[PDB]
Amino acid sequence: MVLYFIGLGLYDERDITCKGLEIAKKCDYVFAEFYTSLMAGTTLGRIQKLIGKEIRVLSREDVELNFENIVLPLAKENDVAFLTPGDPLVATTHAELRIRAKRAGVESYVIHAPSIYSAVGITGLHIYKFGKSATVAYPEGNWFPTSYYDVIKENAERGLHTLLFLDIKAEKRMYMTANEAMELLLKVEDMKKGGVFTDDTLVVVLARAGSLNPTIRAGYVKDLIREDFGDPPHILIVPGKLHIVEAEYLVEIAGAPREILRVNV
Amino acid sequence: MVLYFIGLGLYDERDITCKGLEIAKKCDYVFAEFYTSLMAGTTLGRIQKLIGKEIRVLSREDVELNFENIVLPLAKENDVAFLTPGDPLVATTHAELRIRAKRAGVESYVIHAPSIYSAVGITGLHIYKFGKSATVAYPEGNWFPTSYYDVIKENAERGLHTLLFLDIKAEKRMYMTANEAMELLLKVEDMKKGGVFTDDTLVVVLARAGSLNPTIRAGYVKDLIREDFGDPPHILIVPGKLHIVEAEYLVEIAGAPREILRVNV
Ligand SMILES: Nc1ncnc2c1ncn2[C@@H]1O[C@H](CSCC[C@H](N)C(=O)O)[C@@H](O)[C@H]1O
Numbered sequence A, B: 001m002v003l004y005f006i007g008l009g010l011y012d013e014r015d016i017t018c019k020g021l022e023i024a025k026k027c028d029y030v031f032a033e034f035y036t037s038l039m040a041g042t043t044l045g046r047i048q049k050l051i052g053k054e055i056r057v058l059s060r061e062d063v064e065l066n067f068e069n070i071v072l073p074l075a076k077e078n079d080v081a082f083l084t085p086g087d088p089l090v091a092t093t094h095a096e097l098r099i100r101a102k103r104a105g106v107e108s109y110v111i112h113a114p115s116i117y118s119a120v121g122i123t124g125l126h127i128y129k130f131g132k133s134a135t136v137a138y139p140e141g142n143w144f145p146t147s148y149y150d151v152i153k154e155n156a157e158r159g160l161h162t163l164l165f166l167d168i169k170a171e172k173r174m175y176m177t178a179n180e181a182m183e184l185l186l187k188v189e190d191m192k193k194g195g196v197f198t199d200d201t202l203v204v205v206l207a208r209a210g211s212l213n214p215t216i217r218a219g220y221v222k223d224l225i226r227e228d229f230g231d232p233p234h235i236l237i238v239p240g241k242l243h244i245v246e247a248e249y250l251v252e253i254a255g256a257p258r259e260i261l262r263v264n265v
């Protein structure tokens, strides 16, 4: 009578840890959701074939409203697994599902998996220099989210990098690209005019982390805003003050303009 | 002709990803480093047994000074693997190694794995709320470093959580405990008197992230500074103002006192 939260990783079914795989193979019932992120290199079949079980995919509503009615009941008499993209507790609200499990008298365990939050290390930017993170959300009707713009400003003033999770509407199969995120940011800059995000701002794009050939690009907005970074998922990063070696990496590995090697201390 | 940077995960030999294990097994040579961190829930022998390859351990100097004379030469005519605890490229000096690979005409690919950076999500604290990260270092001789205290100050001041890595002496296999870290911080608070870290400060301790039975504890320094958090390694987090959902998780899951539901929200 246990519930396992198991991350599947960044790109394909093999990004799962061996610990999670062996545990998943021996669970009675296996559930999962694919609305918190996109694993571009795999399919449900591949996942099912890898763990040797049929997986019941749950919708956001099934989880947020009926987790305790669909999943927990079974966990009271069996060993149940709940699979998610990346790490199950990073930039999701799944952590609260553990409280529900507790209230239903169900023991829960977390099996971590590679996450985009730590994968940013592949950009060459020192991971400890990242500040507050934010999400660039799609404007809805007359509602135009902008708080993520202030997060960048706040981190930039402190010389810290800003990681920007990009929006996702799984049901509409919509995955915000770094380009769309750059366009939204420019529109917010146009209205707020804080000199936070312009055509001359240096940004970094990481696409399909987890795959062997992710797209890692660094450069000025004016040049990257119309560039093709490949299929989603994407994340956008606005670096703060760069260390010489961060700039060297961005140039040598992310194809940034050599001139960023010239750091303004 | 190929060098693989492969993460070993958080705690034991099963924390590597299925993808990382397959690739490691197919490599001609396998190197590893255990100076940036250790795999406390396993041994070199168990890791070597799992991969079925002999693992040549490299020291900090081997890597930082001679990576190109020890690892890259073999990577020119074979498939080589470089294993590191956690997620590759997280340790600040590792990203530069890919530049060294490029300069040597060696292709490199990164195979991610869980990192404490994302695994701390198990504390219930929202990831986007973490600010700049830092390391608590042991004072030595006439050197009393305190920047990690200022980091906590700048983060907390902006409502952000501060992730604190604790000092480690890999070669001597000696870890700084959360208890020791708190003592130092109270000591630093006594000299700077900035009202950042006191007996009433709320803190979270995460130990053995990755294992199925990690220690997640939250409470005030006055009650935790002498509590036994078990075997290392320990991770210390000084949360900023909490969101009610975070506080509820720390209470129900991390045994935090209900007092935080009114005092720290
Ligand atoms: N492989 C990947 N490459 C690029 N961005 C990714 C990614 N996986 C997730 N993201 C980013 O994160 C968003 C989902 S947020 C949920 C993150 C997940 N729990 C994790 O641990 O990674 C996506 O919309 C995208 O912006």
Ligand code: NA
Binding pocket: A127, A128, A130, A131, B130, B131, B132, B133
């Ligand atoms: Na961070």
